[PDB]
Design a protein around this ligand. Sequence first.
Ligand SMILES: CC(C)(COP(=O)(O)OP(=O)(O)OC[C@H]1O[C@@H](n2cnc3c(N)ncnc32)[C@H](O)[C@@H]1OP(=O)(O)O)[C@@H](O)C(=O)NCCC(=O)NCCS
Ligand code: NA
Ligand code: NA
Ligand code: NA
Ligand code: NA
Ligand code: NA
Ligand code: NA
Ligand code: NA
Ligand code: NA
Ligand code: NA
Ligand code: NA
Length: 225
Amino acid sequence: VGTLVASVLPATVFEDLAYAELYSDPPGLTPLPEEAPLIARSVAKRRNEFITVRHCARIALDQLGVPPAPILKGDKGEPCWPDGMVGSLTHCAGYRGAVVGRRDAVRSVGIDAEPHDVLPNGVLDAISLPAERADMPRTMPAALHWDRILFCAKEATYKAWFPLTKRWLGFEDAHITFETDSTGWTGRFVSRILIDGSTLSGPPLTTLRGRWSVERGLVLTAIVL
Ligand SMILES: CC(C)(COP(=O)(O)OP(=O)(O)OC[C@H]1O[C@@H](n2cnc3c(N)ncnc32)[C@H](O)[C@@H]1OP(=O)(O)O)[C@@H](O)C(=O)NCCC(=O)NCCS
Ligand code: NA
Ligand code: NA
Ligand code: NA
Ligand code: NA
Ligand code: NA
Ligand code: NA
Ligand code: NA
Ligand code: NA
Ligand code: NA
Ligand code: NA
């Protein structure tokens, strides 16, 4: 079983998390009939990864004692987790993953996987603030593609934020600061929210702490609130 995503999960709430990942689409996976409408008009690549990522979601939920069931799609694409559960899903070339948590210990999860590849510069200025572009090179080893790592953290931030607020969060609306561990391939980040953080219940979101990792040609990030 693969354990790349454990490199970005916390120990403090680990017993209330579970995860499952795969690196390709198993052949011949049939969609659940209740989930098939979600991909009824989708291209084959989207259908195949959707079915794999939902499979990972149910394996991870089963570890937390949740019986397998369909996971529908809600406001703005967000997955509809079973009662008492939270989680997040991601895919990219070579990666499909789910991390889920018990809501009584975990308020929200956001994860993202990317290929550890450059982004174009025009995609970088649209996805970053000036202070990020100044500070990332100061805090990240020169071997790493900081543009891509910053973007991966932006995506995990939106996924952790949206289920709590049900509002947009733009690339300009969170300033993310990083640190690198002395081993050079993992570290921590903090996403500072620059807009109103009001949530549907509980205290407003102001800073979201996460972890990042680069390995096996992938960037992984996770935020567990
Ligand atoms: C929604 C988004 C973050 C998804 O990320 P992605 O890199 O395109 O794709 P991933 O495979 O990593 O993640 C897709 C999964 O995200 C989840 N997701 C989609 N919308 C979501 C939402 N509103 N809230 C939480 N999770 C959501 C879904 O599980 C989806 O997979 P599924 O359709 O198979 O269920 C991205 O497409 C997007 O729209 N980003 C713009 C918002 C943003 O990044 N703001 C910057 C904040 S600092
Ligand atoms: Na457990
Ligand atoms: Na695999
Ligand atoms: Na559902
Ligand atoms: Na969610
Ligand atoms: Na990809
Ligand atoms: Na360094
Ligand atoms: Na600012
Ligand atoms: Na910050
Ligand atoms: Na930084
Ligand atoms: Na590592």
